Amino acid sequence: IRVWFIKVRKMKAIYHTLNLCNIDVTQKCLIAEVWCPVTDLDSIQFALRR
Amino acid sequence: SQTQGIQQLLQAEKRAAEKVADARKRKARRLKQAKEEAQMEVEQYRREREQEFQSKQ
């Protein structure tokens, strides 16, 4: 039951993050404006390519 | 990054409108053209059956 809780809560959190979205005219892609450290951008893009 | 986003939309709109209109026009004209072709070939078939019935007589 605990892991069911954490899965469901996180998934709610994912939907919350997805609420913040580029409402484009036609794009099926999304362009999000986010603040992020310049320190870790190498790990950022490593994660993205993963 | 700000130019291509509208280029996509414009070419997509062009394709959608042009293709729906072209299909509808193709449809309306193929009605009459198929009608004419089928009717004339029917008349030629009627000539063929005229020939066959004359031979049988």
Curated annotation (Swiss-Prot), chain A:
Function: Subunit of the V0 complex of vacuolar(H+)-ATPase (V-ATPase), a multisubunit enzyme composed of a peripheral complex (V1) that hydrolyzes ATP and a membrane integral complex (V0) that translocates protons. V-ATPase is responsible for the acidification of various organelles, such as lysosomes, endosomes, the trans-Golgi network, and secretory granules, including synaptic vesicles. In certain cell types, can be exported to the plasma membrane, where it is involved in the acidification of the extracellular environment. Required for assembly and activity of the vacuolar ATPase.
Origin superkingdom: Eukaryota
Binding partners and assembly: V-ATPase is a heteromultimeric enzyme made up of two complexes: the ATP-hydrolytic V1 complex and the proton translocation V0 complex. The V1 complex consists of three catalytic AB heterodimers that form a heterohexamer, three peripheral stalks each consisting of EG heterodimers, one central rotor including subunits D and F, and the regulatory subunits C and H. The proton translocation complex V0 consists of the proton transport subunit a, a ring of proteolipid subunits c9c'', rotary subunit d, subunits e and f, and the accessory subunits ATP6AP1/Ac45 and ATP6AP2/PRR. Interacts with SPAAR.
Phenotypic consequence of gene deletion: Embryonic lethal. Knockout embryos die at 5 to 6 dpc, before gastrulation.
Organism for this UniProt entry: Mus musculus
Gene encoding the protein: Atp6v0a1
Stated family: Belongs to the V-ATPase 116 kDa subunit family.
Known tissue expression: Predominantly expressed in neurons in the cortex and in the dentate gyrus, CA1 and CA3 regions of the hippocampus (at protein level). Expressed at lower levels in astrocytes, oligodendrocytes and microglia (at protein level). In the cerebellum, present in Purkinje and granule cells (at protein level).
Protein's name in the database: V-type proton ATPase 116 kDa subunit a 1
Compartments it resides in: Cytoplasmic vesicle, Clathrin-coated vesicle membrane; Cytoplasmic vesicle, Secretory vesicle, Synaptic vesicle membrane; Melanosome
Lineage: Eukaryota, Metazoa, Chordata, Craniata, Vertebrata
From Swiss-Prot, chain B:
Location(s), subcellular: Melanosome; Cytoplasmic vesicle, Clathrin-coated vesicle membrane
Biased composition (Basic and acidic residues): 33-53
Function: Subunit of the V1 complex of vacuolar(H+)-ATPase (V-ATPase), a multisubunit enzyme composed of a peripheral complex (V1) that hydrolyzes ATP and a membrane integral complex (V0) that translocates protons. V-ATPase is responsible for acidifying and maintaining the pH of intracellular compartments and in some cell types, is targeted to the plasma membrane, where it is responsible for acidifying the extracellular environment.
Family: Belongs to the V-ATPase G subunit family.
Oligomer and partners: V-ATPase is a heteromultimeric enzyme made up of two complexes: the ATP-hydrolytic V1 complex and the proton translocation V0 complex. The V1 complex consists of three catalytic AB heterodimers that form a heterohexamer, three peripheral stalks each consisting of EG heterodimers, one central rotor including subunits D and F, and the regulatory subunits C and H. The proton translocation complex V0 consists of the proton transport subunit a, a ring of proteolipid subunits c9c'', rotary subunit d, subunits e and f, and the accessory subunits ATP6AP1/Ac45 and ATP6AP2/PRR.
Name of the protein this chain belongs to: V-type proton ATPase subunit G 2
Upper lineage: Eukaryota, Metazoa, Chordata, Craniata, Vertebrata
Residues of the full protein shown: 3 to 59 of 118
